[PDB]
């Protein structure tokens, strides 16, 4: 945002005094703007909203539709789960719930786990979901044809380092640099 | 050349040139639809054949065709100036919706072909007339009363209070 | 005092004139119809327009 500094500088035409630009403005006229209804092609349901546009671009298209990209999701209903997307600890219900939720939260694993329903299904950590998603993607790749454990070691190493009591933090960090 | 200062009251329209000490043209903001279209100066005289509408209620523009006609009268009759050759300063009640300010800009630039425009809050302009860096402005206008606190010329929108009695309903009482 | 200190009289920066035909910066001014212009094509167009205007009026 800012750090409490001078105000922004904005474009202006009527610097000087509209005696300079009297001619440059009088000789031209504006393109007629209109409040026009539009429907974004990115909308699965064809709802319509208003906004200001030039009345020569009316109803053309919504430039932000190109931001509507989505990441893929695997598919299985009756037999692909048993044949290819096999599992022995996760039910079809839990896998489908996790997959729909991952689409909800666009494979943002942390908030995915945050939502992961702990009372419709048994508890588990983020890296379990991450590695299971990797496994399902690998299986899909095979039919359609770095290490989670070290990440757990990560979480525990950071937890130990930070939970370290302040005096030990200072002493060890001294010991850290001395050698 | 000069900038046009058109103040759109709630029943009283004030107009003039930038730098003048007083609004040369003052005419009631009346518009009448026969039983053509006429604005206060002639409308107030033509009542017998006319039905009188007000385009500004409580400082917020009611409908835009009548206000269009008010501005047309202002310029072409009262001021005789060409809108295409003068910058226009418009004043609107505090707490005017965004759509209303946008429509005011649209009407000015499109219909009246003004080269340069500005919309300023009436209370801040009254403070400018008073000449104080910070203040609280009690503006019992033509159709609504507004209490506007201003710090360093910046109107604090959250604190602005509207009470819906003023000169007109007072006259009714 | 006024003779020696007239002072005041702001300079009043001029108007950046434009050519009506090509909307280019103006560098000429037609003695008849002091409309500014920038090209010779603009000049003949301006003179034709003045002829039509005076015919109409």
């Amino acid at each position: 945002s800012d750090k409490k500094d001078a105000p922004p500088l904005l474009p202006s035409d009527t610097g000087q005094g509209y005696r300079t630009v009297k001619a440059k403005l009088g000789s031209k006229k504006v393109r007629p703007w209109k409040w026009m209804p539009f429907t974004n092609p990115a909308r699965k349901d064809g709802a319509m909203f208003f906004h200001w546009r030039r009345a020569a671009e009316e109803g053309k298209d919504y430039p932000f539709a190109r931001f509507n990209k989505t990441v893929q999701v695997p598919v299985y209903s009756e037999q692909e789960y048993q044949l290819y997307l096999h599992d022995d600890a996760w039910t079809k219900a839990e896998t489908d719930h996790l997959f729909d939720l991952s689409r909800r939260f666009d494979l943002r694993f942390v908030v995915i786990h945050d939502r992961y329903d702990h009372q419709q299904f048994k508890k588990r950590s983020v890296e379990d979901l991450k590695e299971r998603y990797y496994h399902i993607c690998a299986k899909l790749a095979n039919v359609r044809a770095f290490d989670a454990g070290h990440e757990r070691r990560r979480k525990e190493q950071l937890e130990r380092l930070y939970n370290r009591t302040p005096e030990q933090v200072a002493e060890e960090e001294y010991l850290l640099q001395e050698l | 050349i000069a900038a046009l200062v058109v103040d759109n009251g709630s029943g009283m329209c004030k107009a003039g040139f930038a730098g003048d000490d007083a609004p040369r043209a003052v005419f009631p903001s009346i518009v009448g639809r026969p039983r053509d279209s006429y604005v206060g100066d002639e409308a107030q005289s033509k009542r017998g054949i006319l039905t009188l509408k007000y385009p500004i209620e409580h400082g917020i523009v009611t409908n835009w065709d009548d206000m269009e006609k008010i501005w047309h009268h202002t310029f072409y009759n009262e001021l005789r100036v060409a809108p295409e050759e003068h910058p226009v300063l418009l004043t609107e009640a505090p707490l005017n919706p965004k759509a209303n300010r946008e429509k005011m800009t649209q009407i000015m630039f499109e219909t009246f072909n003004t080269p340069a425009m500005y919309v300023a809050i009436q209370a801040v302009l009254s403070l400018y007339a008073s000449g104080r860096t910070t203040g609280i402005v009690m503006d019992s206008g033509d159709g609504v009363t507004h209490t506007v606190p201003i710090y360093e010329g910046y109107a604090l929108p959250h604190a602005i209070l509207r009470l819906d009695l003023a000169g007109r309903d007072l006259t009714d009482y | 005092f006024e003779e020696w200190f007239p002072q005041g009289r702001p300079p009043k920066v001029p108007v950046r004139e434009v050519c009506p035909v090509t909307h280019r910066p103006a560098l000429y001014r037609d003695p008849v119809t002091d409309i500014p212009y920038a090209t010779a094509r603009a000049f003949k167009i301006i003179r034709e327009a003045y002829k039509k205007y005076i015919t109409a009026h």
Partner: peptide, 21 residues
């Protein structure tokens, strides 16, 4: 005056000597 003859051009349209009647 320039606009007494001629006619203003919409922004983006190339200037051509459109003339009022």
């Amino acid at each position: 005056k320039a606009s007494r003859l001629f006619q203003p051009v919409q922004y983006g349209q190339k200037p051509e000597g459109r003339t009022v009647a």
